[PDB]
Amino acid sequence: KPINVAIFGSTGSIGTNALNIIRECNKIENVFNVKALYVNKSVNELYEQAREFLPEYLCIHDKSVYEELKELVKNIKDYKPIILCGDEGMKEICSSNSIDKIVIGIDSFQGLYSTMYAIMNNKIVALANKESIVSAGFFLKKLLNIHKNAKIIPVDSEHSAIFQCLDNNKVLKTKCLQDNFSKINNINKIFLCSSGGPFQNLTMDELKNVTSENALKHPKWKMGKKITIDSATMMNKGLEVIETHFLFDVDYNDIEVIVHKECIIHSCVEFIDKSVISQMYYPDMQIPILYSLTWPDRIKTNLKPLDLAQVSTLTFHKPSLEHFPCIKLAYQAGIKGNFYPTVLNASNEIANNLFLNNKIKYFDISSIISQVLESFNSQKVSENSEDLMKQILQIHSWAKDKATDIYNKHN
């Protein structure tokens, strides 16, 4: 019973960690068939991936490097893949009966599009892109009720942890992003653990003057620039609060952010009897990715066993909302509901990039996001799926423009 997987965004962080753990697990026994790989324009890296995994399908988004892919791939002996291009290629791969599970390792707003078509083809969607859930949660909910066989399985590390803490006999009576998921799983409350980021111990006056270099340099854990900035402001965690709400139907007043600087306990689930279950390991994306592909089973790995005695000490504290106002904004937008999460995510995209590029200061990030949120007005939510997606796109675009306008008016 092999597991037939497509990897979307195969040359990125998530994509390469997916192939790493598949590679390593396949050495123990051959359980995975990599059936498709899809990237934007990393044609030389995609070639190299195809040489190893020999997927049936290859797809590159950017048509301008299509012919170069075809040329590179002729050098592979006895290998005749289907080489596809752009959105059309993505829809073709998602509609293959030969593919059961698709890892979505495509970043930013763009990740939502492939998520959508994987759901429409009733696949298991291993979704790392939290922005898709934040921006399009209710739409994704609606879609998952049309496509009863589709499932989103979380890959974001804390959400994977939460999922790993549940009893699958209860999970199988529902699915992620369903109303009443928490009630069916007897969930009371979530502890959503955080690294706390590089600024975790700075004073207000120090925060006033921090730069993106300070966020990016000497990192404990080397990550991409956008998520590093979001880790520094703790807007990552704020996005992850909304992600928790949508995935597991947990009320906002039942999600507690906790700073856990050792990053061993990945998050915790309090049940209605007050028992708490947690998922622990070294900081790690290979188990989250793997579990998304093996769920509801687990398979053997050769990962290093956790040495709790060596770890020795674990610590927990409450984040300061004054120092990390992005967290408060995320709760506020989440609780308001409607399209306020879309607006949060979009305005943060702009504010994050302004700070990265040294155009604004740390507290301007939250200032801009706050002002965009305040200017939005709740919109009647379309009952039609197509119109709902058009609303999300329009609101996303509006909010990014509004953020930029606020920046330019002050500047």
Distance (Å, whole) CA 93 – CA 252:
37
The annotation status of 173 as a binding-site residue, yes or no, is: no
Q: How far is the CB of 326 from Mn ion (least distance, A)?
A: 15
Beta carbon nearer to ligand NDP, 207 or 245: 245
Q: What dihedral angle (degrees, nearest 10) is formed by the CA atoms of 225, 231, 235, 239?
A: 90
First and final C-alpha spacing in the chain: 60
**Nearest alpha-carbon partner for 240 in 341, 325, 324, 340:** 341
Tokens of 403: 């953020």
Omega prior to 341 cis, within 30 of 0: no
Beta carbon nearer to Mn ion, 56 or 349: 349
153-165 burial code (b ≥16 CB/10 A, e <16): bbbbbbbbbbbbb
| Residue owning tokens 């509004």 | 402
Beta carbon nearer to Ca ion, 64 or 145: 64
Q: How far is the CB of 256 from a second copy (least distance, A)?
A: 8
Distance (Å, whole) CA 357 – CA 43:
28
Confirm or reject binding of residue 158 to ligand NDP (CB under 6 A). no
Neighbours of 142 (CB within 10 A): 18
Sign of CA dihedral 140, 324, 228, 367: positive
Q: Which of residues 132-171 bind a second copy (CB under 8 A)?
A: 164-171
Listed ranges 12-20, 160-168, 327-335, 398-406: which one lies at the site for ligand NDP (CB under 6 A):
12-20
Q: How far is the CB of 188 from Ca ion (least distance, A)?
A: 7
Strands 255-259, 265-271: pairing kind? unpaired
Confirm or reject binding of residue 156 to Mn ion (CB under 5 A). yes
Q: Pick from a second copy, ligand NDP, Ca ion, none: which does 381 bind, CB < 5 to 8 A by kind? A: none
Which of 157, 160, 182, 391 binds Mn ion (CB under 5 A)? It is 157
Q: How far is the CB of 208 from ligand NDP (least distance, A)?
A: 27
Q: Pick from ligand A1L4W, Ca ion, ligand NDP, none: which does 167 bind, CB < 5 to 8 A by kind? A: Ca ion
Q: Which residues bind ligand NDP (CB under 6 A)?
A: 9-15, 38-42, 61, 105-107, 110-111, 128-131, 156-157, 224, 227, 285
Q: Which residues bind ligand A1L4W (CB under 6 A)?
A: 156-158, 194-195, 197, 221, 223, 227, 231, 236-237, 263, 283-285
Q: Which residues are annotated as a binding site for Mg(2+)?
A: 156, 158, 240
Q: Which residues bind Mn ion (CB under 5 A)?
A: 156-158
